[PDB]
Assembly symmetry: C3
Homo-oligomer: 128 residues x 3
């Protein structure tokens, strides 16, 4: 009788409450199902950006290569101070050379004066 109509009253109340929870549950699963797929795309985007970075790195030059170069550069820099000295030796060998040419033209002229004297002397002596 009414014990039944109370169990039924309880049974309906539970059922209605169960229905609200399911609706609310379904909603939540939709919220999370959508996020997890936006995450799956966000992470497949990233792993492909990273394979680009991995690649774009296989292209950038080592640091050891560029520290060899800065050594070999400073090596050649120093060799330029070893063979910058023998530039001012040229400007010194040209002025001395020139001096030597001047003295040589002066020596020649003395010889030609001398030769003229000796021509004179050989004549004076045969004229006796």
């Amino acid at each position: 009788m009414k014990q039944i109509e109370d169990k039924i009253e309880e049974i309906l109340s539970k059922i209605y409450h169960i229905e609200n929870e399911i609706a609310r549950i379904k909603k939540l699963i939709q919220n999370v199902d959508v996020r997890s797929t936006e995450n799956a795309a966000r992470s497949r985007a990233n792993e492909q950006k990273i394979a680009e970075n991995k690649k774009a790195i296989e292209n950038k030059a080592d640091k050891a290569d560029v520290e060899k170069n800065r050594a070999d550069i400073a090596a050649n820099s120093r060799a330029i101070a070893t063979f910058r000295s023998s530039s001012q030796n040229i400007a010194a060998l040209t002025t001395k050379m020139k001096q030597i040419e001047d003295k040589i033209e002066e020596i020649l002229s003395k010889i030609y004066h001398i030769e003229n004297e000796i021509a004179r002397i050989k004549k004076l002596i045969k004229l006796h």
Copy 2:
């Protein structure tokens, strides 16, 4: 007894529906769980791979150092063609030199013949 029966029927239909909805929820839920654990695995791997790239990046050369080297190299190259006309000046000095060497020996040769002819003049004088 035929209102208690109508409500009971309403419940049996409602229960069957709720059961069917719960089966939908479970497998749906399962899949979001399955997918979210992938996304987690994917995002931590990517984390590892991002790290790897951060290190590799650290072993590559900063452009500014490579740009230094370029400039230094060019300024070395500047002061190297600069010392090509140094040796241009040499080839003139070497020839100008051998022109002086050939003179000096001729000068000597005229001088030796002068000496001889003086020795002659002197001997000619004493005998008179």
Copy 3:
């Protein structure tokens, strides 16, 4: 009889269902959170990737360093040649020295000659 027995069943199915729902709620909640973590982790990763992309925009390519390496080995090959030349300076310096010497040899021979001649000029005027 036959009402009481359906109601009995119904109450057992409700209880069964209440457990399924309370189990479902913590599954969902767990998965919700795991996805909120996944979401931030993947947003962070994209920020880190985006620091690596910006650190790649401050490094030199292989081509440019390869170039520098060639430019250098040239300047080594170009110098080394020129280095062999400039030993020809040392040759002019000592040869100039020998000359300087031969000239002072010559200059002094001449002065002794001038002297002899000065005497001869006089001796011939003395006849």
